[PDB]
């Protein structure tokens, strides 16, 4: 259409607030203070196309997954209300995290204010994803051990809330603090070792490894570290600046890792639910 006509612009002519990655040389969206232009750009080819769709498609998937999970027969669960509320808080975190991100990337070029407000929701989004992922996992791991289940939930809440407070800070969004962000969110997810070690100390090596806690956790931690390293080190556009502007840049690859990582986590924690079903409720 002949309304809100725009063109992809080189990195150099971007305002300071829109200059995030110096390695993405071309294909940027010019600052357009119209949500109309912003939401149509979802159907255009630019630096954020991949970013929008990865978490736009992932968002509907987790929503349908969340919907279907809730409608699961109450027969398949030992405590259908409890397990459904624990899985619910994970989907609440997954859906919110993804919805915030694809919305942020869509409305990224509106204004300095819109970017500021939406970037804050984007970072806070991830902290809700880490907090939400812990709730079902911590619940199944500390099923017949209620005191640590409760303690560890508070530490994740306080740390997650701290990560939400840290994301509000304006210096936090600067490209120099990219490393700080990567470390902050890595620390939050990597806090998984405290409950794991407690679990391993009590359940046993064989018992923790029998159940795929380790197989699943090494993979979790791998995605967590391989995933943050890409974000912080800006691979592969660090080498190859240009040619990676539209496809397969670090943010795009990282976006794929969030969707992939959240699905794999759901799969691991859905197995714990299935095992508990075979075992039944209570303890020896």
């Amino acid at each position: 259409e002949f309304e809100g006509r725009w063109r992809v612009i080189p990195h150099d002519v971007l305002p300071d607030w829109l200059k995030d990655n110096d390695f993405l040389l071309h294909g940027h969206r010019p600052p357009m203070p119209s949500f109309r232009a912003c939401f149509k750009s979802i159907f255009r080819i630019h630096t954020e196309t991949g970013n929008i769709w990865t978490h736009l498609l992932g968002c509907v998937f987790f929503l349908c997954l969340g919907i279907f999970y809730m409608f699961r027969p109450n027969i398949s669960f030992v405590a259908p209300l409890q397990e459904k509320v624990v899985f619910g808080l994970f989907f609440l975190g997954a859906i919110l995290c993804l919805s915030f991100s694809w919305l942020f990337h869509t409305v990224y070029c509106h204004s300095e204010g819109v970017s500021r407000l939406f970037s804050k929701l984007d970072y806070s989004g991830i902290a809700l994803l880490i907090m939400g992922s812990f709730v079902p996992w911590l619940y199944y791991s500390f099923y017949c051990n209620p005191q640590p289940c409760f303690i560890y939930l508070i530490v994740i809440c306080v740390l997650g809330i701290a990560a939400i407070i840290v994301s509000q800070w304006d210096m936090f969004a600067t490209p120099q603090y990219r490393g700080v962000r990567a470390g902050v969110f890595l620390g939050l997810g990597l806090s998984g070792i405290i409950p794991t070690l407690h679990y391993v100390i009590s359940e046993g090596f064989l018992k923790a490894a029998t159940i795929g806690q380790i197989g699943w956790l090494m993979l979790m931690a791998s995605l967590y570290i391989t995933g943050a390293a890409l974000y912080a080190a800006r691979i592969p556009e660090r080498f190859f600046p240009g040619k990676c502007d539209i496809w397969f840049h670090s943010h795009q690859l990282f976006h794929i890792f969030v969707v992939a990582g959240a699905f794999v986590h759901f799969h691991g924690v859905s197995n714990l639910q299935e095992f508990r079903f075979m075992i039944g409720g209570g303890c020896s």
């Epitope: 309304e3 006509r5 063109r7 080189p10 969206r29 600052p31 357009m32 203070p33 119209s34």
Partner: single-chain antibody
Framework: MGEVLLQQSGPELVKPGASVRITCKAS????????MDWVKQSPGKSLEWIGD????????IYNQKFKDKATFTVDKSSSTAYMELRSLTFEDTAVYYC???????????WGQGTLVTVSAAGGGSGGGGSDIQMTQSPASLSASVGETVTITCRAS??????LAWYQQKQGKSPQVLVY???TLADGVPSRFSGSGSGTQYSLKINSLQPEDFGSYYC?????????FGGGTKLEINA
Amino acid sequence: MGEVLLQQSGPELVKPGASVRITCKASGYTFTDFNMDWVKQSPGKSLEWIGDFNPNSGGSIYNQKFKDKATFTVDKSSSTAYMELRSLTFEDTAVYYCARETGTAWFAYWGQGTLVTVSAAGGGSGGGGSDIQMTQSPASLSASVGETVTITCRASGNIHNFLAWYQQKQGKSPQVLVYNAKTLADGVPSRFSGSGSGTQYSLKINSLQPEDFGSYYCQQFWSTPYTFGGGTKLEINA
């Protein structure tokens, strides 16, 4: 290069019914990266959008006023843009500008201006008005130095904050002050402040200075054809 410069051909004095080919030499950037626009300003009158040309694609979009009168060509090799005006009449006596678009059609860089004078001293039609009407208030004002002035722009339809403010000194090309309704352009003093939403926008100059006199224009770049406001003549008594 060091600076983005748009440089056009020299003044033209033509016989009625002739044809002129105006040149715009673009330097300081990748020529193909941005659209180039052509703007006509008749003597003592506001700016009119002739059309835009995409140097990469080679695609031209024309204002229907100039659909028959103007043609856009390029030379990606010499980094020049051209505009051919044909079957020239007395009405065509105007200064024609090339203005470079950035992402959105607000003009950061302007050509010096080529004057086409149509004269039969050596031996047709009219101009309309379409789609988004830009209304500027006041048409003229005069304020003592240090005073605060507010200029408004009212669009016939919603332009979605795709509004730019220009200042024009006597016999010079307009220079952008504000783009995207509130964003302040590079080198423009903090005195200029752009505010507005929907169809009603305003420009406020605080503690006006002797350099502040000139003509102020507002441009809408939401819909095509892009339109300019009638202008505000600002005189400084001091």
